[PDB]
Design an enzyme around this catalytic site. Structure first.
Site, PDB file in Angstrom:
ATOM      1  N   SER A 165      -2.603   1.352   2.232  1.00  0.00           N
ATOM      2  CA  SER A 165      -3.851   1.852   1.665  1.00  0.00           C
ATOM      3  C   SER A 165      -4.991   1.683   2.681  1.00  0.00           C
ATOM      4  CB  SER A 165      -4.085   1.000   0.417  1.00  0.00           C
ATOM      5  OG  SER A 165      -4.881   1.665  -0.598  1.00  0.00           O
ATOM      6  N   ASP A 176       0.336   9.818  -6.480  1.00  0.00           N
ATOM      7  CA  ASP A 176      -0.750   9.129  -5.806  1.00  0.00           C
ATOM      8  C   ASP A 176      -1.749  10.197  -5.393  1.00  0.00           C
ATOM      9  OD1 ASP A 176      -0.876   7.009  -2.788  1.00  0.00           O
ATOM     10  OD2 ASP A 176      -2.429   7.679  -4.189  1.00  0.00           O
ATOM     11  N   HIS A 231       0.536   4.928  -6.111  1.00  0.00           N
ATOM     12  CA  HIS A 231      -0.187   4.281  -5.027  1.00  0.00           C
ATOM     13  C   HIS A 231      -0.065   2.772  -5.235  1.00  0.00           C
ATOM     14  CE1 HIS A 231      -3.096   4.183  -1.762  1.00  0.00           C
ATOM     15  NE2 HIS A 231      -3.600   3.117  -2.359  1.00  0.00           N
TER      16      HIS A 231
END
Length: 308
Positions: free
Chosen positions: A153, A250, A280
């Site tokens: 991320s 995601d 995600h």
């Protein structure tokens, strides 16, 4: 047995019982996978130390895998958490999997978080941490030609930016980029499909995304700043080979895809894998979700092959 429980038990029971008769409390505490109920894979060694940099000191946690011999390939890792949350503990399980199955020494960096430290603090920390470690390759018996960067991320964003900074600054040498559902950016006047599609109902939402950006960034112009959205950088040529993992459900799925295209466009070697049935931040479900577990190890196996 309750569905999820049966699954976690086998996931948590995967590893045998530690020789309790000769187990110290400090060791048990560092490895216990009870709360949170996330499995911590064993490694040969875990060291925590400080990294004195100009203006600030960053905590670091080094993971040396069992069965590997020097010179060690390595991975400088930056945790996820949208530039606002996360620390060395939240991603400890993830780093253990990458070290163990990736067969590489992993260095998890505790970079500064926003809004206390606004952009580009994290970016400076990411690069400087890489530089500090690379300068000390011998100190950790690392192979200078096999030092990679990576993150999940926001961390994937930092790894990607660090690679560009390392290119512009002349070094250090980076052998590979491991980008796990990275937040590599996009053009707001051309938001990819997934941004609209998975805006709600999958942990990472649009409202959350704007909020995170508010905490991290100082102005609207920074939304297209290359150190925030590296996919917009005009010259991605000569960067380290990369592996990108995306999650189907995601909102950043297509974001990861867009970075693979930008890298490919610039002649950079890149592999991108989209994981079905995952969301995600699935690395946080290692040992809890069978799919997440398989995917994270798959990612570690990609790191191993890349640094072989």
């Amino acid at each position: 047995l309750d569905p999820v429980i049966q699954q976690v038990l086998d996931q948590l029971n995967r590893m045998p019982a530690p020789d309790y008769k000769h187990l110290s409390a400090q060791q048990f505490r560092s490895q216990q996978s009870l709360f949170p109920p996330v499995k911590k894979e064993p490694v040969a060694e875990v060291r925590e130390f400080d990294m004195d940099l100009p203006g600030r000191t960053l905590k670091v946690r080094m993971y040396r895998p069992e069965g590997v011999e020097p010179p060690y390939p390595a991975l400088v890792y930056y945790h996820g958490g949208s530039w606002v949350v996360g620390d060395l503990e939240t991603h400890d399980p993830v780093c253990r999997v990458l070290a163990k199955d990736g067969r590489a020494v992993v260095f998890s960096v505790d970079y500064r978080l926003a809004p206390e430290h606004k952009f580009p603090a994290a970016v400076e920390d990411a690069y400087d941490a890489l530089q500090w470690i690379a300068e000390r390759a011998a100190d950790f018996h690392l192979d200078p030609a096999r030092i990679a960067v990576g993150g999940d991320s926001a961390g994937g964003n930092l790894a990607a930016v660090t690679s560009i900074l390392a290119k512009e600054r002349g070094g250090p040498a980076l052998a590979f980029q491991l980008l796990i559902y990275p937040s590599t950016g996009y053009d707001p006047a051309h938001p990819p499909a997934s941004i609209e599609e998975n805006a709600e109902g999958y942990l990472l939402t649009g409202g959350m995304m704007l909020w995170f950006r508010d905490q991290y960034l100082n102005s609207l112009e920074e939304l297209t700043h290359p150190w925030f959205s590296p996919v917009l950088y005009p010259d991605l040529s000569g960067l380290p080979p990369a592996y990108i993992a995306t999650a189907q459900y995601d909102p950043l799925r297509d974001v990861g895809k867009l970075y693979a295209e930008a890298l490919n466009k610039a002649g950079v070697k890149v592999e991108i894998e989209n994981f079905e049935d995952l969301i995600h931040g699935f690395a946080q479900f290692y040992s809890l979700s069978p799919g997440a577990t398989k995917a994270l190890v798959r990612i570690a196996e990609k790191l191993r092959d890349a640094l072989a």
